[PDB]
From a paper:
We found that it forms a Class-7 steric zipper (Ref. In addition, to further prove that β-strands F and H can participate in amyloid core formation of TTR fibrils, we determined the crystal structure of the steric zippers formed by the segments in isolation by x-ray crystallography. The crystal structure of 91AEVVFT96 revealed a Class-7 steric zipper with antiparallel β-strands and antiparallel sheets (Ref. In the isolated segment 91AEVVFT96, proline replacements in positions 92 and 94 completely prevented fibrillization.
Transthyretin (TTR)3 is a 55-kDa protein that aggregates into amyloid fibrils under pathological conditions. In its native tetrameric conformation, TTR transports retinol-binding protein and thyroxine (T4) in the blood and cerebrospinal fluid. Amyloid aggregation of TTR occurs by dissociation of tetrameric TTR into monomers; these partially unfold into amyloidogenic intermediates and self-associate into soluble oligomers and amyloid aggregates. Here we identify two segments of TTR that drive protein aggregation by self-association and formation of steric zipper spines of amyloid fibrils.
Residue numbers in the entry:
A (entry chain A), B (entry chain A), C (entry chain B), D (entry chain A), E (entry chain B), F (entry chain A), ...: 1 to 6
Write the structure that this text describes.
């Protein structure tokens, strides 16, 4: 699982 | 920007 | 921004 | 910026 | 910013 | 598990 | 899994 | 799975 908030 | 890989 | 998962 | 790898 | 996981 | 807040 | 950003 | 954006 990968979460990237930018 | 939101990326969610599950 | 928000993510919730299960 | 938030990165969460699980 | 916040993450909670289990 | 990797959390990176920047 | 990998993320790169700028 | 992959995403690239600019």
């Amino acid at each position: 699982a990968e979460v990237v908030f930018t």
